[PDB]
Amino acid sequence: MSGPERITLAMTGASGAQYGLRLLDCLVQEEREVHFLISKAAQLVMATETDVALPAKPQAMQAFLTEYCGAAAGQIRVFGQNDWMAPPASGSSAPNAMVICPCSTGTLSAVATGACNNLIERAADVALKERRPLVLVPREAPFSSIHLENMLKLSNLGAVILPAAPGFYHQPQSVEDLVDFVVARILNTLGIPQDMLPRWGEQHLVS
Amino acid sequence: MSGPERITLAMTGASGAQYGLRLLDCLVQEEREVHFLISKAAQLVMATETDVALPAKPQAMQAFLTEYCGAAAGQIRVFGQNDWMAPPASGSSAPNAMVICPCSTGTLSAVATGACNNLIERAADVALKERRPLVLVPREAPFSSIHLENMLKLSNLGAVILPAAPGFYHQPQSVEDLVDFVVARILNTLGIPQDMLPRWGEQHLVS
Amino acid sequence: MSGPERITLAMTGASGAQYGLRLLDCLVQEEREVHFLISKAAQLVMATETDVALPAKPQAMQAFLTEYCGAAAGQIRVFGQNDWMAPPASGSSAPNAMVICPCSTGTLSAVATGACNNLIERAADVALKERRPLVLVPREAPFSSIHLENMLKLSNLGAVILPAAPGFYHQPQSVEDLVDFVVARILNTLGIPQDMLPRWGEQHLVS
Amino acid sequence: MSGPERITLAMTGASGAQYGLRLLDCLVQEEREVHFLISKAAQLVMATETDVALPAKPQAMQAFLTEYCGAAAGQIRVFGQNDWMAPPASGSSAPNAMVICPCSTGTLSAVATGACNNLIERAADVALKERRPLVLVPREAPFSSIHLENMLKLSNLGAVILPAAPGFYHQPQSVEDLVDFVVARILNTLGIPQDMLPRWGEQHLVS
Amino acid sequence: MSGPERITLAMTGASGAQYGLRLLDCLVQEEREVHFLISKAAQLVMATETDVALPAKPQAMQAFLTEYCGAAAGQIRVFGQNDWMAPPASGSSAPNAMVICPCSTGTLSAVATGACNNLIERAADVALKERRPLVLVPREAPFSSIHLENMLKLSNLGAVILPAAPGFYHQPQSVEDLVDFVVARILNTLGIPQDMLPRWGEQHLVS
Amino acid sequence: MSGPERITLAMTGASGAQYGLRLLDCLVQEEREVHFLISKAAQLVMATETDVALPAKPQAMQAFLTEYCGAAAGQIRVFGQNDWMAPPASGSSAPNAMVICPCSTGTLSAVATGACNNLIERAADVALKERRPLVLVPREAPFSSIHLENMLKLSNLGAVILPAAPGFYHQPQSVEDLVDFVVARILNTLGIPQDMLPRWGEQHLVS
Amino acid sequence: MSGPERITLAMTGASGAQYGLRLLDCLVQEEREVHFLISKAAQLVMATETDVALPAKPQAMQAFLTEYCGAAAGQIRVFGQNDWMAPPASGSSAPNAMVICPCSTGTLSAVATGACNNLIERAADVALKERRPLVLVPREAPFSSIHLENMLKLSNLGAVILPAAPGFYHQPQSVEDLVDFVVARILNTLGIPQDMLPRWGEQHLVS
Amino acid sequence: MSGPERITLAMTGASGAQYGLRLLDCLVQEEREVHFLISKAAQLVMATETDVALPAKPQAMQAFLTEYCGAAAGQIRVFGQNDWMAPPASGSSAPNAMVICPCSTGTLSAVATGACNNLIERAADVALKERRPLVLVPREAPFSSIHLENMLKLSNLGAVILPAAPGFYHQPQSVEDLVDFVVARILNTLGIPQDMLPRWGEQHLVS
Ligand SMILES: Cc1cc2c3c(c1C)C(C)(C)CC=[N+]3c1c([nH]c(=O)[nH]c1=O)N2C[C@H](O)[C@H](O)[C@H](O)COP(=O)(O)O
Ligand SMILES: Cc1cc2c3c(c1C)C(C)(C)CC=[N+]3c1c([nH]c(=O)[nH]c1=O)N2C[C@H](O)[C@H](O)[C@H](O)COP(=O)(O)O
Ligand SMILES: Cc1cc2c3c(c1C)C(C)(C)CC=[N+]3c1c([nH]c(=O)[nH]c1=O)N2C[C@H](O)[C@H](O)[C@H](O)COP(=O)(O)O
Ligand SMILES: Cc1cc2c3c(c1C)C(C)(C)CC=[N+]3c1c([nH]c(=O)[nH]c1=O)N2C[C@H](O)[C@H](O)[C@H](O)COP(=O)(O)O
Ligand SMILES: Cc1cc2c3c(c1C)C(C)(C)CC=[N+]3c1c([nH]c(=O)[nH]c1=O)N2C[C@H](O)[C@H](O)[C@H](O)COP(=O)(O)O
Numbered sequence A, B, C, D, E, F, G, H: 001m002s003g004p005e006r007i008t009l010a011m012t013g014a015s016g017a018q019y020g021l022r023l024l025d026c027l028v029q030e031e032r033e034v035h036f037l038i039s040k041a042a043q044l045v046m047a048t049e050t051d052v053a054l055p056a057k058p059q060a061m062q063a064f065l066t067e068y069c070g071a072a073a074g075q076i077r078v079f080g081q082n083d084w085m086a087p088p089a090s091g092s093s094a095p096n097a098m099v100i101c102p103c104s105t106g107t108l109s110a111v112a113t114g115a116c117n118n119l120i121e122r123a124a125d126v127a128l129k130e131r132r133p134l135v136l137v138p139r140e141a142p143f144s145s146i147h148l149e150n151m152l153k154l155s156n157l158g159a160v161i162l163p164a165a166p167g168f169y170h171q172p173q174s175v176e177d178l179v180d181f182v183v184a185r186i187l188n189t190l191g192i193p194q195d196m197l198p199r200w201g202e203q204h205l206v207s
């Protein structure tokens, strides 16, 4: 298997809940283990923008998402926002890649400054200290200089700043096809197989 | 009339030709004068991603776009890539706002370093020196640190870095509704009226 | 197989065409796929410094190099300087490592600033954004502070700055042995096997 | 086998000789090849803080450590402080990971500035230029700003700054259990198996 | 009496609760007044790593610690996390020295950025603005560049960054002797007498 | 007694041996304890510029200086350049102030970068980490930017950069009176009484 | 003739009037033309520290100094502090080297920031813009970080920061011999012959 | 005569002893005086890579090199690594240009930080403070960011960073012709005549 066995998927309070759910579903189909974290603001976004009725408490959430994705028994683990007993809270945990999708500008700030105010922020702090993959998927416009400084600092440290900025070069027909572009880019970054976005120019031999 | 009378609209070689055409059409409907500039790479993008058959030479382009948008006689001016006789090449020109949509990472670089290799890049250099509005609409993912440094430098100088990162909070039903989100944000930035994206919370009085 | 399956090999206009041709030949012998890019200035260098008569147009070049190296059918792909349909132009391409050998100071600048003026520069921009290997092989002396700043910026982002500065510690007898030192260092960087430069001290057990 | 085949283990003159000896012993048990380097000041520390009577000259040291650890024939190589014929002195050597444990503040300085005054410092300079793993294990308190600047510079370049700051969350009963915490973190960093420190939260499924 | 009359002792959520309790006990024995602050995460650490059953609410905590240490009547003051009426919340308070032991990376961040989210963070902000002693005792490994930048900024402003990195040069026999090394260094920093760690070389006259 | 009880006085290889000997003599007269360190290059300077025949080995040096200054029994301690058992090598030592007089540009460099190559450099590293007084007395001209950067870094951290730049405003009659100006400034910095340089304007009441 | 034909010699309000007068005298003996500028504070220093009774108004000063030095008719030109008609006020003047000896910390500041408050400061601003030699001779101790930053900035731009820090390695017998050391260094910097300070090691052939 | 009368030629421990010997020989043929300095590591390089049997002690070395080059009586002066009586140790020496060829990365570091650990490093420190020519000829690959930062700092101060990166544009036939390219560039930098590398384009009048 190419790519990581385990992904920590954190959803925070930016627009774009559909990207995080689609990623969750793709990861499950590629038989990966997912450690799923969601902020209170992200729960309000998912309520506002989607018709996914996600239960509030972690065990009910775990059961709902397991059904939603067709996941195996304990393939998706759900941890609450202060559960310091969860693997992402410590660098002594087994290695996983982390993706924050969508990543609010407030979460981006916390990760860039080291704030650790909750498990998502601590998980990212641990990813950086242990040199484990960290992918941030902001969805904001305009980006202010505050945002850009925080992204630059993190990029220079080896985090991947992957904005929710879909391309249009594979004839998208629906909102879902734009969602799938961004998700495909995340999986490419992680080294996980995907077949939603072809390899550019792969059959072009010369000219 | 709120907002600028004249906009220089530059399209460069990033994915997202639909955003630039939609903006062009909205500007025309708001009775603004548009000084339209398009790079060779952007012409290849518009060919690849859209079914708009845009003529190559500036007078034919001007006629095509005038028809496409329903514009008035000489409402859209089209200038080629080395036409230094055009108003955007000099700061002694009448003031206009400039938008580069989509803005390639190569154009972003040129604007951040001052390269002036063609009329688009020179136009942006002039906008910055004259303190006229400059909005850049990049479409790239991931953003590398090269990109982020260039965006930060320009943001700190007062350019608006407005990524093609649509929101999902107004129940988008189509690819067009995502395009219209980004276009609405550009027009809001410019102070030009738009009715594609409601004013958030405008009827919320308390709680 | 250790090391990458596919290498993008870009030759630009610094002295040292022999290094790029030797690398091309070694990569072919290690059964790798090569996406070969050459600038106009590099073509004038190869004419000035070598007796390799390299055809100008990409399909003739592809045939010439395939013969020169003994490569397999479509093992070497050749792309022209504005061929945006080629795999290196997009990060949605299959992953490859990129080497720019020789790397002119003008190309070094473009990569450090993000200029993207042609396919070589765009390919490097993509390597950096996707965190794929990027090795730059400058050949210049003196290095000015302009050069050194650009190299530092790129090194700090994880590019490998590998000057064409051969060592003399393996009893070189010819110009070719100096060329092979530098090529061996490139292949070591990439993780590709080579037997031109022994492993230093490999049989020294103690003292 | 996960992790590197060969480790360069350098011991320098900070308190904490026990960490370096314990690491040496763990590496040997995981059947790795160790290129062992020790400074004169580190030899005085090991004399002051431990009851290990380590011979001064490299072949006697090699024999002593081989016995101490139960190592195989030439599993541990010992090189003196100016032995430029040893593999760590050149980047043309076979790849290994390097750990400096303990790392004195003087060694940290030398690595951050590039001083190369002896084989340890040169070995680290080579690790950085070749992008091979480099882990520094300082033991100092307070850290001054001199120290912190040097650590930051090296961390930003991809070295791992791993202070000898044991945790207490696995019920340590002895000085040895604290030593083993730090050693476990080094081996985790290197990707080498260890069973001294459990994976945090590995059996926690939800809450 | 040498050293400060009053210490604000803040315990935050890093491993190493034993260091903070030992310091508390030493300060009490040196007849100092202690303003004790503890975060919720630190309370969970003390529960996880020690057999100290510390009551949750501040008056019960005050009574427990007073008994635990043998302190005098109101020698230990305990303030909750939002008690802005407490002396540490204002610079108009009587001067005290502040120690944060252990100091989580999240607390380090807050102090370096000025976040003031609770009384501990505000107390540190006040120490810095009033130029009163501030000692931070982090316990983390590896230190990432995020951490190191925050430590450097604070060190450059005159805070003392004192990692929980015990030395081994006074023949430690137990976990307690390592704890006492770090505590002795804190008291030395503060100018408070201690007899757990001898003065190095104090009887060495020459050589 | 005002000022420190114990001074570490390090002499390094810049011109100006007379300043260090004069300071040594003044410190002895003010009944302070002196921990005296001298580099090999400083010994060659004292031979070149003075008629002081200073013995090479530390106990003979100690006896010579004790006689030269009229010091009490073990008032002057002399430590050699690698004597890590001496108090200045550790921050667990009793507090003293440190003066490096004269301070070579090489010593200034080592202190600014943290090099610790000998006891003098380590002593300074310890002074900085423990926030103990550190006064550097360079004697060089011109100062290059290398020198000035190193001085600035150290000044910003709270070291006192006190060049051997005597004033002429107290009617100096001899080389000795210029030496005494600089020595008086060092003692003023340390808070040690001196009567060689009057207090400027002390009897001026008004105008 | 080696070295410049014309020197602008500015004396400002630091201690060390003797250095400026000695330099003036040496320049006159080497048949150079001197454009002499003196601040009001420097006039008060020369009154306080020397027995030179220097007239206040520029023509009387010119006559006095001409006599004092044995200069030729109009060899010394004297300009007042706001005489913008004097050659040093403009870069269109004939080239000369400039020395500010002594250079007050206030003058150093003005030159580093560009303040131009009087002819001395403007003259230095002109030297820097025209890339003409500028030598600053500060006499201050300690140097604060304010001072050091200003010196560094100017050194990095190519000014020579030459502190009044005499050496003792040519057996000085008097205050005058220390003055002559510093003056010799200034003349060496300027490329003007001097015989007060021998060429170090000039007769040493080997060892 | 164009160029300097006297060159300090320092050889340090990088590969490329042939460049330093060739330069030495060219300087001697141009009747310059050479102050030759060689490090211990450079002596081991010259033994490893060449068949030059260079005696260890400075007078024997002086005699050997004088014969090797055909130099005049005392045309080559040889100084050992701590000979502070030699002209390069002081800025009061007669002016010479300095070249460090090859320049190890350790020597580059020392020169950039001001370390002065031996006569070579001190000589370079003096060249920089006196604004005398300093040319560094590194031979390393890859260059790490440590190296590049040190080169940049020195380049910005006016040192010439001239890598041992030969060009191929004058039809080199042998290893010697590559050596001569680099040597020709050094002599061009110094302003010393050479006829090994023609003046590019000197007979091209137009096109
Ligand atoms: C609830 C809420 C918060 C939005 C938000 C919306 C809602 C419903 C939308 C969907 C209506 C409109 C867009 N929003 C954005 C957003 N932050 C951001 O970076 N990008 C967003 O696109 N925010 C703000 C963000 O949630 C906050 O600043 C939270 O404090 C983030 O906290 P978190 O990082 O712990 O999730
Ligand atoms: C033609 C071409 C160029 C793409 C491109 C594509 C094509 C068709 C797509 C649509 C197939 C895939 C995505 N592309 C992107 C892109 N540059 C960029 O910043 N973002 C893009 O989304 N580029 C590269 C960009 O066009 C170049 O680097 C040009 O040199 C930009 O030149 P310009 O700034 O003058 O327009
Ligand atoms: C054609 C040409 C260009 C040389 C050159 C030569 C020629 C024949 C030589 C071989 C005669 C002499 C040395 N050259 C160097 C060089 N640039 C550089 O960094 N190092 C070189 O060694 N250049 C300049 C370089 O080619 C330019 O600045 C181009 O604009 C680079 O464009 P490119 O990056 O797209 O290839
Ligand atoms: C010998 C000696 C040197 C100690 C030392 C001790 C001794 C016995 C102890 C064990 C008694 C007390 C603590 N020490 C520390 C230390 N340097 C440091 O960063 N942390 C330490 O914990 N040092 C100083 C350090 O050894 C020096 O500054 C050397 O010059 C380092 O040289 P090295 O990097 O080549 O080993
Ligand atoms: C509860 C909890 C939190 C640990 C923790 C542990 C637990 C039990 C351990 C003991 C099991 C494992 C190690 N931990 C560390 C830690 N933070 C840190 O900098 N170093 C630590 O050593 N953390 C995380 C830290 O508590 C958080 O990031 C909190 O948000 C800090 O909040 P605070 O600054 O207000 O106390």
Ligand SMILES: Cc1cc2c3c(c1C)C(C)(C)CC=[N+]3c1c([nH]c(=O)[nH]c1=O)N2C[C@H](O)[C@H](O)[C@H](O)COP(=O)(O)O
Binding pocket: F011, F012, F013, F014, F015, F016, F039, F040, F041, F042, F044, F045, F048, F103, F104, F105, F106, F107, F139, F140, G167, G169, H084, H090, H116, H117, H118, H122
């Ligand atoms: C021996 C020697 C070294 C001089 C020196 C002299 C001699 C006799 C003099 C007295 C003849 C001329 C002036 N010297 C100066 C000097 N370094 C410096 O910063 N300022 C000086 O004034 N140096 C160089 C300095 O000694 C070195 O660079 C040593 O490596 C410093 O080593 P140290 O810091 O361990 O003492």
Ligand SMILES: Cc1cc2c3c(c1C)C(C)(C)CC=[N+]3c1c([nH]c(=O)[nH]c1=O)N2C[C@H](O)[C@H](O)[C@H](O)COP(=O)(O)O
Binding pocket: F167, F169, G011, G012, G013, G014, G015, G016, G039, G040, G041, G042, G044, G045, G048, G103, G104, G105, G106, G107, G139, G140
């Ligand atoms: C008059 C006066 C001013 C001294 C001074 C003295 C006097 C007599 C002395 C001789 C008694 C004591 C030392 N002084 C120094 C000094 N400034 C300085 O950088 N170094 C000095 O050595 N100053 C201060 C300096 O003169 C001021 O700050 C002026 O504003 C400088 O103005 P200027 O640059 O235009 O000359």
Ligand SMILES: Cc1cc2c3c(c1C)C(C)(C)CC=[N+]3c1c([nH]c(=O)[nH]c1=O)N2C[C@H](O)[C@H](O)[C@H](O)COP(=O)(O)O
Binding pocket: C167, C169, D084, D090, D116, D117, D118, D122, H011, H012, H013, H014, H015, H016, H039, H040, H041, H042, H044, H045, H048, H103, H104, H105, H106, H107, H139, H140
């Ligand atoms: C002896 C030795 C040292 C090599 C070396 C070799 C040997 C024989 C070779 C020839 C086998 C392989 C390449 N080497 C290089 C090298 N340093 C460097 O910057 N570039 C080199 O090309 N080094 C390391 C360098 O010598 C050290 O780091 C010394 O401490 C430098 O000390 P120095 O600056 O005083 O000469």
